[PDB]
Write a protein that binds this ligand. Structure first.
Ligand SMILES: CCCCCC/C=C\CCCCCCCCCC(=O)O
Ligand SMILES: CCCCCC/C=C\CCCCCCCCCC(=O)O
Ligand SMILES: CCCCCCCO[C@@H]1O[C@H](CO)[C@@H](O)[C@H](O)[C@H]1O
Ligand SMILES: CCCCCCCO[C@@H]1O[C@H](CO)[C@@H](O)[C@H](O)[C@H]1O
Lengths: 250, 254
């Protein structure tokens, strides 16, 4: 039952992610605006929670929390938990940033992004104003997001999309390729069915989404090269140890 | 409470491992195990007596047994306090580098100078037969015997072995470990318990605890050497398959 499968994935998503596209979108039409050093200082003063590195550290804190939620979410995808633990780890290593950057779009518009559970809005112009390595780490994610948003997915669509992202059978070093592939196919048949039901007039949505998954893999490939490089060129700036593990040999 | 902690680890071990040293030792001296000592008796054993080229076939039975023990060790680990709260990548590193040390320590439980119990005590495979297989294979098996017979002279029981194996898995110095200080903290808790347990359980055995600490370094070297031999069978013996989980375990090991 593809409808039942769809609904359980969706409820797994609602359970594990507090900020949904529904909540984000309703807010995006009250949050404290962060657009310079001063407003950031204020935001950190209780209102919401060098400049470029500090923003980078805030970014790391948010993505590592999203990795945690994705790890708990994956446990609810049928058959994920029955994979050997080393296969679960490989799947998370390689999929968690593709999922993060897909879900980023839910909290973005052309002008900036919601932070701290909707309490703040950080403007894209401020992020463009940061020093060179950091500024162009962030901008490509905005570019992907505004385009992604034009597909007009909802949270029920996104739940299946992220599930399908995590269960990629072609991740480097996967042990049981055929089992992962089989579970992914189940999610995708569900996703195709759900898009028919949810988006009846949206011709071509499902191949569009499959192409978005390849786009995300290249977004993340390019992201990793940039993070890998900051690790060398930017001697003073720290990387969270879990992120260090994720980018290690990626 | 070092005594409560010990009991909980003991029970996690009873739960996850069917063959205990207790059960093994009473078998090694209900009906006797079928003796496997040549091609013919192995064939009979697999004809439902015990299970339901000779050197490679034995090697494949070895793989099947150790991968089953890996599975039991992974479940066992979940019950060691604080193991499950480690990030999943750290749990995987701990099992990767610890499962075979734990395996070869528990091997001693089912071994005597003459051979080893197989299939839940249904079978006894002689050491002479295993010495008789082709060079690479005979050479992987024999050092485990040498380790086990020495290990058995310490006269540990299942309650001792449970904390020992826990301590093995929570080794803070495994290559590529993320949260080193936290793994070290959990191990120290296990070792304190173990030290307490040996003094209660083996009051006369002074120096047992340092002896055990040295056995863990002995096992690390046993396994380093095992991995080197397994990695080489992969290259030279191209016709003989390696279970995909063991291939993952030995991948980039040393
Ligand atoms: C103050 C900034 C608000 C944080 C917004 C969300 C944070 C990160 C979203 C992804 C941005 C891409 C580059 C930054 C991510 C670096 C850390 C990582 O690689 O996980
Ligand atoms: C037919 C013979 C059955 C023997 C089964 C006993 C199980 C283990 C004792 C031998 C362990 C050492 C052999 C090398 C292990 C190969 C697979 C592995 O490395 O996990
Ligand atoms: C689940 C039982 C424990 C299995 C232990 C096997 C661990 O293998 C390791 O898995 C990692 C991905 O998870 C890879 O990054 C390493 O290259 C690989 O060697
Ligand atoms: C906690 C879920 C997310 C974890 C992502 C971290 C995965 O890192 C990988 O973990 C393996 C050990 O498990 C190592 O072999 C690899 O070298 C490392 O790159």
């Amino acid at each position: 039952d593809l409808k039942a499968f769809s609904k359980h994935i969706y409820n797994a998503y609602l359970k594990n992610f507090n900020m949904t596209k529904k909540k984000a979108r309703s807010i995006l039409t009250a949050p404290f605006v962060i657009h310079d050093i001063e407003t950031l200082w204020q935001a950190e003063k209780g209102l919401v929670w060098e400049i470029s590195v500090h923003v980078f550290y805030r970014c790391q804190c948010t993505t590592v929390e999203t990795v945690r939620e994705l790890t708990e979410f994956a446990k609810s995808i049928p058959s994920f938990s029955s994979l050997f633990l080393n296969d679960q780890v490989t799947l998370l290593k390689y999929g968690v940033h593709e999922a993060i950057f897909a879900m980023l779009a839910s909290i973005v518009n052309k002008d900036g992004l919601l932070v701290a559970n909707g309490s703040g809005f950080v403007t894209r112009e401020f992020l463009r104003s940061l020093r060179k390595p950091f500024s162009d780490i962030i901008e490509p994610k905005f570019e992907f997001a505004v385009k992604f948003n034009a597909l007009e997915l909802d949270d029920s669509d996104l739940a299946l999309f992220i599930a399908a992202i995590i269960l990629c059978g072609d991740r480097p070093g996967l042990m049981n390729v055929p089992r992962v592939e089989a579970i992914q196919d189940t999610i995708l048949r569900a996703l195709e069915f759900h898009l028919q039901a949810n988006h009846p007039d949206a011709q071509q949505l499902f191949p569009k989404l499959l192409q978005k998954m390849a786009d995300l893999r290249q977004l993340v490939t390019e992201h990793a090269q940039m993070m890998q490089r900051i690790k060398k060129t930017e001697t003073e700036t720290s990387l969270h140890p879990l992120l260090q593990e994720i980018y290690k040999d990626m």
